[PDB]
PDB file of C-alpha atoms (C1' of nucleotides) and ligand atoms in Angstrom:
ATOM      1  CA  UNK A   7     -51.836 -22.656 -73.408  1.00  0.00           C
ATOM      2  CA  UNK A   8     -54.975 -25.337 -71.920  1.00  0.00           C
ATOM      3  CA  UNK A   9     -57.566 -24.750 -69.694  1.00  0.00           C
ATOM      4  CA  UNK A  10     -56.434 -27.446 -67.636  1.00  0.00           C
ATOM      5  CA  UNK A  11     -52.788 -25.990 -66.673  1.00  0.00           C
ATOM      6  CA  UNK A  12     -53.556 -23.179 -64.226  1.00  0.00           C
ATOM      7  CA  UNK A  13     -51.603 -22.970 -61.486  1.00  0.00           C
ATOM      8  CA  UNK A  14     -53.230 -23.025 -57.698  1.00  0.00           C
ATOM      9  CA  UNK A  15     -52.254 -23.182 -54.268  1.00  0.00           C
ATOM     10  CA  UNK A  16     -52.336 -26.602 -52.857  1.00  0.00           C
ATOM     11  CA  UNK A  17     -52.158 -25.990 -49.142  1.00  0.00           C
ATOM     12  CA  UNK A  18     -50.480 -23.513 -46.580  1.00  0.00           C
ATOM     13  CA  UNK A  19     -48.872 -25.082 -43.315  1.00  0.00           C
ATOM     14  CA  UNK A  20     -47.840 -22.856 -40.415  1.00  0.00           C
ATOM     15  CA  UNK A  21     -45.206 -23.884 -38.011  1.00  0.00           C
ATOM     16  CA  UNK A  22     -44.204 -22.546 -34.804  1.00  0.00           C
ATOM     17  CA  UNK A  23     -41.096 -24.059 -33.396  1.00  0.00           C
ATOM     18  CA  UNK A  24     -41.239 -22.767 -29.625  1.00  0.00           C
ATOM     19  CA  UNK A  25     -39.013 -25.263 -28.355  1.00  0.00           C
ATOM     20  CA  UNK A  26     -40.275 -25.457 -25.489  1.00  0.00           C
ATOM     21  CA  UNK A  27     -42.961 -27.992 -23.559  1.00  0.00           C
ATOM     22  CA  UNK A  28     -45.623 -26.841 -21.521  1.00  0.00           C
ATOM     23  CA  UNK A  29     -47.849 -23.403 -20.727  1.00  0.00           C
ATOM     24  CA  UNK A  30     -45.883 -21.665 -23.876  1.00  0.00           C
ATOM     25  CA  UNK A  31     -46.843 -25.025 -26.140  1.00  0.00           C
ATOM     26  CA  UNK A  32     -50.332 -24.163 -24.450  1.00  0.00           C
ATOM     27  CA  UNK A  33     -50.529 -20.514 -25.509  1.00  0.00           C
ATOM     28  CA  UNK A  34     -49.688 -21.189 -29.201  1.00  0.00           C
ATOM     29  CA  UNK A  35     -51.771 -24.453 -29.581  1.00  0.00           C
ATOM     30  CA  UNK A  36     -54.962 -21.752 -28.500  1.00  0.00           C
ATOM     31  CA  UNK A  37     -53.602 -18.540 -30.971  1.00  0.00           C
ATOM     32  CA  UNK A  38     -52.755 -21.027 -33.698  1.00  0.00           C
ATOM     33  CA  UNK A  39     -56.632 -22.392 -33.510  1.00  0.00           C
ATOM     34  CA  UNK A  40     -57.564 -19.035 -33.844  1.00  0.00           C
ATOM     35  CA  UNK A  41     -55.838 -17.983 -36.701  1.00  0.00           C
ATOM     36  CA  UNK A  42     -57.579 -20.603 -38.804  1.00  0.00           C
ATOM     37  CA  UNK A  43     -60.440 -21.721 -37.166  1.00  0.00           C
ATOM     38  CA  UNK A  44     -59.354 -25.463 -37.193  1.00  0.00           C
ATOM     39  CA  UNK A  45     -57.482 -28.025 -34.667  1.00  0.00           C
ATOM     40  CA  UNK A  46     -53.511 -28.143 -34.801  1.00  0.00           C
ATOM     41  CA  UNK A  47     -51.190 -30.809 -33.745  1.00  0.00           C
ATOM     42  CA  UNK A  48     -47.739 -31.115 -31.468  1.00  0.00           C
ATOM     43  CA  UNK A  49     -45.387 -32.019 -33.134  1.00  0.00           C
ATOM     44  CA  UNK A  50     -42.360 -33.438 -31.487  1.00  0.00           C
ATOM     45  CA  UNK A  51     -39.441 -34.646 -31.788  1.00  0.00           C
ATOM     46  CA  UNK A  52     -40.808 -37.246 -27.273  1.00  0.00           C
ATOM     47  CA  UNK A  53     -40.504 -33.422 -26.699  1.00  0.00           C
ATOM     48  CA  UNK A  54     -43.153 -31.780 -27.733  1.00  0.00           C
ATOM     49  CA  UNK A  55     -41.131 -29.118 -29.060  1.00  0.00           C
ATOM     50  CA  UNK A  56     -42.975 -27.275 -31.535  1.00  0.00           C
ATOM     51  CA  UNK A  57     -46.784 -26.960 -33.349  1.00  0.00           C
ATOM     52  CA  UNK A  58     -48.191 -26.828 -36.438  1.00  0.00           C
ATOM     53  CA  UNK A  59     -51.513 -26.833 -39.078  1.00  0.00           C
ATOM     54  CA  UNK A  60     -51.833 -27.019 -42.465  1.00  0.00           C
ATOM     55  CA  UNK A  61     -54.892 -25.607 -44.565  1.00  0.00           C
ATOM     56  CA  UNK A  62     -55.876 -26.143 -47.832  1.00  0.00           C
ATOM     57  CA  UNK A  63     -58.782 -24.337 -49.623  1.00  0.00           C
ATOM     58  CA  UNK A  64     -60.200 -20.872 -49.496  1.00  0.00           C
ATOM     59  CA  UNK A  65     -59.481 -20.133 -45.872  1.00  0.00           C
ATOM     60  CA  UNK A  66     -55.856 -21.103 -47.088  1.00  0.00           C
ATOM     61  CA  UNK A  67     -56.395 -18.153 -49.424  1.00  0.00           C
ATOM     62  CA  UNK A  68     -57.586 -15.431 -47.232  1.00  0.00           C
ATOM     63  CA  UNK A  69     -54.675 -16.413 -44.571  1.00  0.00           C
ATOM     64  CA  UNK A  70     -52.154 -16.258 -47.543  1.00  0.00           C
ATOM     65  CA  UNK A  71     -53.296 -12.410 -48.194  1.00  0.00           C
ATOM     66  CA  UNK A  72     -53.005 -11.006 -44.564  1.00  0.00           C
ATOM     67  CA  UNK A  73     -49.896 -13.333 -44.412  1.00  0.00           C
ATOM     68  CA  UNK A  74     -48.700 -11.545 -47.642  1.00  0.00           C
ATOM     69  CA  UNK A  75     -50.145  -7.849 -46.224  1.00  0.00           C
ATOM     70  CA  UNK A  76     -47.642  -8.051 -43.403  1.00  0.00           C
ATOM     71  CA  UNK A  77     -44.880  -9.070 -45.590  1.00  0.00           C
ATOM     72  CA  UNK A  78     -45.923  -5.647 -47.572  1.00  0.00           C
ATOM     73  CA  UNK A  79     -46.146  -7.836 -50.885  1.00  0.00           C
ATOM     74  CA  UNK A  80     -42.590  -7.373 -51.520  1.00  0.00           C
ATOM     75  CA  UNK A  81     -40.284 -11.302 -51.689  1.00  0.00           C
ATOM     76  CA  UNK A  82     -36.796 -12.005 -52.044  1.00  0.00           C
ATOM     77  CA  UNK A  83     -35.862 -14.063 -55.019  1.00  0.00           C
ATOM     78  CA  UNK A  84     -34.130 -16.846 -52.914  1.00  0.00           C
ATOM     79  CA  UNK A  85     -36.701 -17.619 -51.450  1.00  0.00           C
ATOM     80  CA  UNK A  86     -38.476 -19.327 -53.782  1.00  0.00           C
ATOM     81  CA  UNK A  87     -37.840 -22.770 -54.672  1.00  0.00           C
ATOM     82  CA  UNK A  88     -36.529 -25.475 -57.267  1.00  0.00           C
ATOM     83  CA  UNK A  89     -39.606 -27.646 -56.532  1.00  0.00           C
ATOM     84  CA  UNK A  90     -42.548 -24.713 -56.973  1.00  0.00           C
ATOM     85  CA  UNK A  91     -42.925 -23.119 -54.299  1.00  0.00           C
ATOM     86  CA  UNK A  92     -42.347 -21.039 -51.676  1.00  0.00           C
ATOM     87  CA  UNK A  93     -42.169 -19.433 -48.133  1.00  0.00           C
ATOM     88  CA  UNK A  94     -41.960 -16.589 -45.317  1.00  0.00           C
ATOM     89  CA  UNK A  95     -42.483 -15.901 -42.115  1.00  0.00           C
ATOM     90  CA  UNK A  96     -43.742 -12.905 -39.574  1.00  0.00           C
ATOM     91  CA  UNK A  97     -42.476 -12.319 -36.148  1.00  0.00           C
ATOM     92  CA  UNK A  98     -45.419 -10.335 -34.399  1.00  0.00           C
ATOM     93  CA  UNK A  99     -48.992 -11.988 -34.022  1.00  0.00           C
ATOM     94  CA  UNK A 100     -50.451  -8.829 -33.156  1.00  0.00           C
ATOM     95  CA  UNK A 101     -49.574  -7.044 -36.492  1.00  0.00           C
ATOM     96  CA  UNK A 102     -51.367  -9.749 -37.818  1.00  0.00           C
ATOM     97  CA  UNK A 103     -54.277  -7.535 -36.727  1.00  0.00           C
ATOM     98  CA  UNK A 104     -55.401 -10.030 -34.258  1.00  0.00           C
ATOM     99  CA  UNK A 105     -56.294  -8.822 -30.962  1.00  0.00           C
ATOM    100  CA  UNK A 106     -54.111  -8.664 -27.755  1.00  0.00           C
ATOM    101  CA  UNK A 107     -53.903 -10.270 -24.670  1.00  0.00           C
ATOM    102  CA  UNK A 108     -51.027  -9.288 -22.174  1.00  0.00           C
ATOM    103  CA  UNK A 109     -51.518 -13.130 -21.311  1.00  0.00           C
ATOM    104  CA  UNK A 110     -50.854 -15.008 -24.357  1.00  0.00           C
ATOM    105  CA  UNK A 111     -48.231 -12.386 -25.733  1.00  0.00           C
ATOM    106  CA  UNK A 112     -45.796 -12.148 -28.823  1.00  0.00           C
ATOM    107  CA  UNK A 113     -45.784 -15.290 -31.191  1.00  0.00           C
ATOM    108  CA  UNK A 114     -44.385 -16.043 -34.642  1.00  0.00           C
ATOM    109  CA  UNK A 115     -45.186 -17.946 -37.664  1.00  0.00           C
ATOM    110  CA  UNK A 116     -43.238 -19.575 -40.404  1.00  0.00           C
ATOM    111  CA  UNK A 117     -45.940 -19.469 -43.719  1.00  0.00           C
ATOM    112  CA  UNK A 118     -45.249 -22.434 -46.451  1.00  0.00           C
ATOM    113  CA  UNK A 119     -47.073 -22.155 -49.470  1.00  0.00           C
ATOM    114  CA  UNK A 120     -46.999 -24.574 -51.805  1.00  0.00           C
ATOM    115  CA  UNK A 121     -48.509 -24.495 -55.800  1.00  0.00           C
ATOM    116  CA  UNK A 122     -48.821 -27.206 -58.045  1.00  0.00           C
ATOM    117  CA  UNK A 123     -50.996 -28.331 -61.365  1.00  0.00           C
ATOM    118  CA  UNK A 124     -54.517 -30.550 -61.056  1.00  0.00           C
ATOM    119  CA  UNK A 125     -52.926 -33.401 -61.834  1.00  0.00           C
ATOM    120  CA  UNK A 126     -51.084 -34.031 -58.553  1.00  0.00           C
ATOM    121  CA  UNK A 127     -53.482 -36.616 -57.723  1.00  0.00           C
ATOM    122  CA  UNK A 128     -52.029 -39.926 -59.617  1.00  0.00           C
ATOM    123  CA  UNK A 129     -48.913 -39.303 -57.520  1.00  0.00           C
ATOM    124  CA  UNK A 130     -50.445 -39.955 -54.547  1.00  0.00           C
ATOM    125  CA  UNK A 131     -53.691 -42.200 -54.738  1.00  0.00           C
ATOM    126  CA  UNK A 132     -53.120 -46.015 -53.127  1.00  0.00           C
ATOM    127  CA  UNK A 133     -54.139 -47.776 -56.739  1.00  0.00           C
ATOM    128  CA  UNK A 134     -52.150 -47.303 -60.189  1.00  0.00           C
ATOM    129  CA  UNK A 135     -50.316 -44.539 -58.991  1.00  0.00           C
ATOM    130  CA  UNK A 136     -47.482 -42.979 -60.598  1.00  0.00           C
ATOM    131  CA  UNK A 137     -44.977 -40.403 -61.956  1.00  0.00           C
ATOM    132  CA  UNK A 138     -46.227 -36.863 -62.707  1.00  0.00           C
ATOM    133  CA  UNK A 139     -44.064 -35.612 -65.815  1.00  0.00           C
ATOM    134  CA  UNK A 140     -41.599 -33.236 -66.711  1.00  0.00           C
ATOM    135  CA  UNK A 141     -43.667 -31.141 -68.627  1.00  0.00           C
ATOM    136  CA  UNK A 142     -46.601 -30.383 -65.739  1.00  0.00           C
ATOM    137  CA  UNK A 143     -44.102 -30.353 -63.188  1.00  0.00           C
ATOM    138  CA  UNK A 144     -44.116 -26.517 -61.591  1.00  0.00           C
ATOM    139  CA  UNK A 145     -40.626 -25.003 -61.885  1.00  0.00           C
ATOM    140  CA  UNK A 146     -39.880 -22.214 -60.257  1.00  0.00           C
ATOM    141  CA  UNK A 147     -39.641 -19.554 -63.598  1.00  0.00           C
ATOM    142  CA  UNK A 148     -43.774 -20.644 -63.527  1.00  0.00           C
ATOM    143  CA  UNK A 149     -44.146 -19.650 -59.578  1.00  0.00           C
ATOM    144  CA  UNK A 150     -42.508 -15.991 -59.576  1.00  0.00           C
ATOM    145  CA  UNK A 151     -44.392 -15.611 -62.784  1.00  0.00           C
ATOM    146  CA  UNK A 152     -47.493 -17.036 -60.974  1.00  0.00           C
ATOM    147  CA  UNK A 153     -46.308 -14.908 -58.022  1.00  0.00           C
ATOM    148  CA  UNK A 154     -46.162 -11.659 -59.578  1.00  0.00           C
ATOM    149  CA  UNK A 155     -49.580 -11.902 -61.943  1.00  0.00           C
ATOM    150  CA  UNK A 156     -51.167 -12.345 -58.224  1.00  0.00           C
ATOM    151  CA  UNK A 157     -50.122 -10.196 -54.986  1.00  0.00           C
ATOM    152  CA  UNK A 158     -47.165  -8.521 -57.337  1.00  0.00           C
ATOM    153  CA  UNK A 159     -43.414  -7.331 -56.629  1.00  0.00           C
ATOM    154  CA  UNK A 160     -40.419  -8.982 -56.456  1.00  0.00           C
ATOM    155  CA  UNK A 161     -36.948  -8.439 -56.230  1.00  0.00           C
ATOM    156  CA  UNK A 162     -33.805 -10.591 -57.318  1.00  0.00           C
TER     157      UNK A 162
ATOM    158  C1'   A B   5      -9.312 -92.096  14.415  1.00  0.00           C
ATOM    159  C1'   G B   6     -10.417 -92.650   9.668  1.00  0.00           C
ATOM    160  C1'   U B   7     -10.308 -90.796   4.405  1.00  0.00           C
ATOM    161  C1'   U B   8      -9.789 -87.292   0.162  1.00  0.00           C
ATOM    162  C1'   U B   9      -6.966 -83.374  -1.666  1.00  0.00           C
ATOM    163  C1'   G B  10     -10.478 -83.044 -10.019  1.00  0.00           C
ATOM    164  C1'   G B  11      -8.782 -83.299 -15.599  1.00  0.00           C
ATOM    165  C1'   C B  12      -6.469 -81.598 -20.307  1.00  0.00           C
ATOM    166  C1'   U B  13      -1.278 -80.245 -21.268  1.00  0.00           C
ATOM    167  C1'   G B  14       4.677 -80.039 -27.290  1.00  0.00           C
ATOM    168  C1'   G B  15       7.405 -83.479 -19.255  1.00  0.00           C
ATOM    169  C1'   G B  16       5.355 -81.729 -14.633  1.00  0.00           C
ATOM    170  C1'   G B  17       3.762 -76.711 -11.740  1.00  0.00           C
ATOM    171  C1'   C B  18       2.185 -71.470 -12.607  1.00  0.00           C
ATOM    172  C1'   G B  19      -1.104 -69.641 -16.390  1.00  0.00           C
ATOM    173  C1'   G B  20      -5.460 -71.103 -20.241  1.00  0.00           C
ATOM    174  C1'   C B  21     -10.956 -74.205 -20.942  1.00  0.00           C
ATOM    175  C1'   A B  22      -9.324 -75.957 -26.224  1.00  0.00           C
ATOM    176  C1'   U B  23     -14.772 -79.796 -19.560  1.00  0.00           C
ATOM    177  C1'   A B  24     -21.650 -78.866 -22.144  1.00  0.00           C
ATOM    178  C1'   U B  25     -21.980 -75.870 -25.688  1.00  0.00           C
ATOM    179  C1'   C B  26     -23.650 -71.204 -30.770  1.00  0.00           C
ATOM    180  C1'   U B  27     -22.006 -68.773 -35.696  1.00  0.00           C
ATOM    181  C1'   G B  28     -18.080 -67.319 -40.190  1.00  0.00           C
ATOM    182  C1'   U B  29     -13.355 -69.172 -41.512  1.00  0.00           C
ATOM    183  C1'   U B  30      -9.497 -73.903 -41.369  1.00  0.00           C
ATOM    184  C1'   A B  31     -12.491 -76.900 -44.681  1.00  0.00           C
ATOM    185  C1'   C B  32      -9.590 -79.203 -50.300  1.00  0.00           C
ATOM    186  C1'   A B  33     -18.019 -76.040 -55.325  1.00  0.00           C
ATOM    187  C1'   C B  34     -22.577 -83.031 -51.760  1.00  0.00           C
ATOM    188  C1'   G B  35     -21.818 -84.857 -46.610  1.00  0.00           C
ATOM    189  C1'   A B  36     -17.869 -85.993 -43.414  1.00  0.00           C
ATOM    190  C1'   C B  37     -12.284 -83.652 -41.383  1.00  0.00           C
ATOM    191  C1'   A B  38      -7.915 -82.220 -36.047  1.00  0.00           C
ATOM    192  C1'   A B  39      -4.663 -78.341 -33.241  1.00  0.00           C
ATOM    193  C1'   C B  40      -3.432 -75.069 -26.095  1.00  0.00           C
ATOM    194  C1'   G B  41      -6.088 -73.208 -34.413  1.00  0.00           C
ATOM    195  C1'   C B  42      -7.259 -67.903 -35.623  1.00  0.00           C
ATOM    196  C1'   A B  43     -12.149 -64.021 -34.577  1.00  0.00           C
ATOM    197  C1'   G B  44     -16.660 -63.978 -31.594  1.00  0.00           C
ATOM    198  C1'   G B  45     -20.397 -65.351 -28.827  1.00  0.00           C
ATOM    199  C1'   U B  46     -23.816 -68.659 -24.830  1.00  0.00           C
ATOM    200  C1'   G B  47     -26.218 -69.812 -18.475  1.00  0.00           C
ATOM    201  C1'   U B  48     -29.718 -64.386 -20.110  1.00  0.00           C
ATOM    202  C1'   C B  49     -34.029 -60.620 -21.660  1.00  0.00           C
ATOM    203  C1'   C B  50     -39.444 -60.139 -22.807  1.00  0.00           C
ATOM    204  C1'   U B  51     -47.653 -59.333 -20.944  1.00  0.00           C
ATOM    205  C1'   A B  52     -44.685 -57.763 -24.578  1.00  0.00           C
ATOM    206  C1'   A B  53     -39.870 -57.456 -27.390  1.00  0.00           C
ATOM    207  C1'   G B  54     -45.790 -63.425 -27.764  1.00  0.00           C
ATOM    208  C1'   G B  55     -50.481 -63.547 -32.000  1.00  0.00           C
ATOM    209  C1'   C B  56     -53.723 -61.324 -36.060  1.00  0.00           C
ATOM    210  C1'   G B  57     -55.226 -57.771 -39.068  1.00  0.00           C
ATOM    211  C1'   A B  58     -54.878 -52.552 -40.855  1.00  0.00           C
ATOM    212  C1'   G B  59     -51.932 -48.342 -42.401  1.00  0.00           C
ATOM    213  C1'   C B  60     -47.652 -46.552 -44.053  1.00  0.00           C
ATOM    214  C1'   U B  61     -42.039 -46.885 -45.510  1.00  0.00           C
ATOM    215  C1'   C B  62     -36.311 -46.763 -43.786  1.00  0.00           C
ATOM    216  C1'   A B  63     -30.672 -44.780 -43.420  1.00  0.00           C
ATOM    217  C1'   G B  64     -29.160 -41.087 -46.084  1.00  0.00           C
ATOM    218  C1'   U B  65     -28.889 -36.759 -50.227  1.00  0.00           C
ATOM    219  C1'   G B  66     -30.332 -32.428 -52.164  1.00  0.00           C
ATOM    220  C1'   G B  67     -33.924 -27.438 -52.302  1.00  0.00           C
ATOM    221  C1'   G B  68     -36.897 -23.948 -49.408  1.00  0.00           C
ATOM    222  C1'   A B  69     -39.254 -21.506 -44.076  1.00  0.00           C
ATOM    223  C1'   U B  70     -39.275 -28.477 -36.276  1.00  0.00           C
ATOM    224  C1'   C B  71     -42.184 -27.527 -41.075  1.00  0.00           C
ATOM    225  C1'   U B  72     -42.466 -28.774 -46.879  1.00  0.00           C
ATOM    226  C1'   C B  73     -40.535 -30.965 -51.873  1.00  0.00           C
ATOM    227  C1'   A B  74     -38.264 -34.737 -54.958  1.00  0.00           C
ATOM    228  C1'   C B  75     -34.677 -38.907 -55.615  1.00  0.00           C
ATOM    229  C1'   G B  76     -34.142 -42.422 -53.377  1.00  0.00           C
ATOM    230  C1'   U B  77     -33.343 -51.810 -54.058  1.00  0.00           C
ATOM    231  C1'   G B  78     -32.371 -51.475 -48.675  1.00  0.00           C
TER     232        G B  78
HETATM  233 MG1  LIG C 222      -2.572 -84.513 -14.860  1.00  0.00          MG
END
RNA sequence: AGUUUGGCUGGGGCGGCAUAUCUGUUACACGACAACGCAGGUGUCCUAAGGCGAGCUCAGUGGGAUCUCACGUG
């Protein structure tokens, strides 16, 4: 329809919940740094439980492609959400292709990807904030269709 | 040897503090109003838990793998 209703990926959030503070977190923070080439931040309950980072842009697309390759380009139907975003997780960072050093060990991570159109600034700008609108909101069926068009594969 | 050995009090004593004080109610829509009336507090604590600028939004609920989106008059 309109040349302004295309669905694009907004951001990619990678989370690693080791559940501990110390050297394990230090290795995880480095591992995320090599993966996305961008400084991560630590999330605490205080306790310093987990580390995470958010990636948006082309490097988000490339990282999404690598994770989908591990997941064999297939996802379950209930992995999606009515908001318009989905996600998954991989268990081994070595299976991502990253070289193995017998010091860091093997870690997993959770991938979340948020989709949306180009009008989402209205709900986030400081001045004259408003709501998006029912038509412009991305539904689950549109999200699943978008995943079928590019990076095809789904199972109900 | 000299002197003292509290008060209030449905007698006095034992008990309690109604002995200096703060909130709601008794209290009768200005103000004031008693009982050993009712439900509870006070003798402390804080170089920040004081002063100001900026940024942000809480309790909770729902959909997804601590992270993410939406709702959310308190
Ligand atoms: Mg007397």
